């Protein structure tokens, strides 16, 4: 591209849409990031966020073949004045080394640090029924106890005087299955 910054503004500068487009894998070739490793300064904020989030959608071989340019993109995005760009660079700076985003956010941006502390103290202190995740529905009893702990029994709302008619239906259809099994 003769003017790579204008090309990225045309492709990704639509401020009405904020997610990365599905075509970002084709948009993020090696030569275009070789160009935006030089023209990252003149880009707008929205296209900066779009680029830094579209680096995630690239396949692993592309990330591995050209990781130094991506390091320069992240370290150049760590000098910008936008808090969004600064945060995204601080979380993407461990991406093309092992494959996982940064999680040790314990030495920068003290506001989110104090918010995280004052909310994690409530998470540790307070928990009602543990809000069992969607993975735990598939799990067996032993896997659930070793993963999330013993299952809390349901709260009692009434005394069951007798089993409902569904139990009788279950018994009689098992009776029917008992005759049809030896057929």
């Amino acid at each position: 591209e003769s003017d790579t910054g204008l090309w990225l503004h045309n492709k990704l500068g639509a401020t009405d849409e904020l997610w990365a487009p599905p075509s970002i894998a084709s948009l993020l070739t090696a030569a275009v990031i070789d160009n935006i490793r030089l023209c990252f300064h003149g880009l707008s904020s929205a296209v900066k966020l779009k680029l830094l989030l579209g680096t995630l959608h690239l396949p692993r071989r592309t990330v591995d073949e050209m990781k130094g340019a991506l390091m320069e993109i992240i370290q150049l995005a760590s000098l910008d004045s936008d808090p969004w760009v600064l945060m995204v660079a601080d979380i993407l700076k461990s991406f093309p080394d092992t494959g996982s985003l940064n999680l040790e956010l314990e030495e920068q941006n003290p506001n989110v640090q104090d918010i995280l502390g004052e909310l994690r103290e409530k998470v540790g202190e307070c928990e009602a029924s543990a809000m069992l995740p969607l993975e735990c529905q598939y799990l067996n009893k032993n896997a659930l106890t070793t993963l999330a702990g013993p299952l809390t029994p349901p709260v009692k709302h009434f005394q069951l005087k007798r089993k409902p008619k569904s139990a009788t239906l279950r018994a009689e259809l098992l009776q029917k299955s008992t005759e049809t099994a030896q057929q």
């Binding site: 995280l116 994690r120 998470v123 307070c126």
Partner: peptide
């Protein structure tokens, strides 16, 4: 992801 690695309450 930061809160989920806590020893208690990470399931929520």
């Amino acid at each position: 992801s930061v809160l989920a690695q806590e020893e208690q309450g990470g399931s929520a």
